[PDB]
Amino acid sequence: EPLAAGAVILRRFAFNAAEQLIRDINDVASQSPFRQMVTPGGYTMSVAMTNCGHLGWTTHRQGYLYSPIDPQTNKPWPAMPQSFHNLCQRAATAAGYPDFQPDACLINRYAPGAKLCLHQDKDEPDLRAPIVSVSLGLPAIFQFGGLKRNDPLKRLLLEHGDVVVWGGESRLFYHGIQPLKAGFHPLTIDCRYNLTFRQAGK
DNA sequence: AGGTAAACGT
């Protein structure tokens, strides 16, 4: 059974690419550090985030925003690594989205206990483009629902190297990550990373 | 009009 209409999980797709991806995560973070963002309502998110590519997702007092500039550094987000772009393109193609051209990559870091409550990826003006989501390090339970918050959730363990792609009918589906279980991974040690690729501009 | 933030009790 496929994940959902327009959605697929490519298990261990990024396994072979993972070591390089993690080197590049470190490189990106060395320029735009991971930060736990504060919601408009004033709560600090448990996931630490950064971005690369032309547009980075951030919170603001007034809401969520894509910006070409990191509000923390006041500099552009780091360029999207070629390893990221190449893996994203290969995954998108395998998943049936050959023409996807991301301009934004959000990098998420989960420590034990860190979670991401159900939400929609909805800040992008062009909903034709899919989301490509790469998991690295410790395993996590991914919730994938529907268009409405109360729609039944599927729970999928995402393991190191797994890639999930959603788009088309499932583009705006609610999704999230359950509190990360403590553990060890030879490549990330004690955390999970996730790369989320999007086309956030025109 | 419409968009839209949302991360505690049972």
Added chain:
DNA sequence: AACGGTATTACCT
């Protein structure tokens, strides 16, 4: 601990 209330409003454009 899985599920669902809350935004059933209060603003901005």
